[PDB]
Ligand binder design. Sequence first.
Ligand SMILES: C=CC1=C(C)C(Cc2[nH]c(Cc3[nH]c(CC4=NC(=O)[C@H](C)[C@H]4C=C)c(C)c3CCC(=O)O)c(CCC(=O)O)c2C)=NC1=O
Ligand code: NA
Ligand code: NA
Length: 184
Amino acid sequence: GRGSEDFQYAIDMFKKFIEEAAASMGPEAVKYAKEFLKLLKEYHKNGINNRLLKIALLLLRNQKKIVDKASQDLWRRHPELIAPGGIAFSQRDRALCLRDYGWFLILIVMCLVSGDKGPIEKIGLKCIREMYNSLGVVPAMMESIRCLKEASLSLLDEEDANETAPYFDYIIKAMSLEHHHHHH
Ligand SMILES: C=CC1=C(C)C(Cc2[nH]c(Cc3[nH]c(CC4=NC(=O)[C@H](C)[C@H]4C=C)c(C)c3CCC(=O)O)c(CCC(=O)O)c2C)=NC1=O
Ligand code: NA
Ligand code: NA
């Protein structure tokens, strides 16, 4: 573990995310992420919005705390996810859940620093589709992102929370549409 208050910390977090999720998100997603990272550094050369970078660093440095808190809330609100026959019953499966939780948070942070939902439109939506192709329609999944949102915004003030909430809402709405319109 390591946390810093520097733009290089966010850059390294994005690189690690790209490296870890490259095989899962596909080649088009990695190209988008690489282009995003290059543009962020190019615009950082001309100065960066400190408020956005502050909220991004605050969410990145507490990534694992947010993941654990959200996962605990989700298991409590839907114990069937970790019970026999559930999607997160297996140790590997539960580990994959926490992985995707951290990746959702990385995507949120990418939108934060960019002030745009682009990274969620391109990468996020596609992955939400692939993820449902491997998991199926599990109703408890709808609370998954809510817990993450509840666990992320709980570390921010009302202004920072208001700046970050729209991306969680966009993700929840997208998953809802994918969930109830998959087999159609
Ligand atoms: C709390 C709900 C969640 C759980 C239980 C999981 C675990 C999980 N991920 C997956 C697979 C999975 N996850 C995801 C999501 C993520 N991929 C990305 O690139 C994004 C960054 C990230 C979300 C944005 C995808 C696309 C896939 C498809 C297969 C793969 O992991 O590459 C499975 C299916 C295992 C299998 O049959 O091979 C499971 C069980 N991920 C959750 O979000
Ligand atoms: Na289940
Ligand atoms: Na299982």
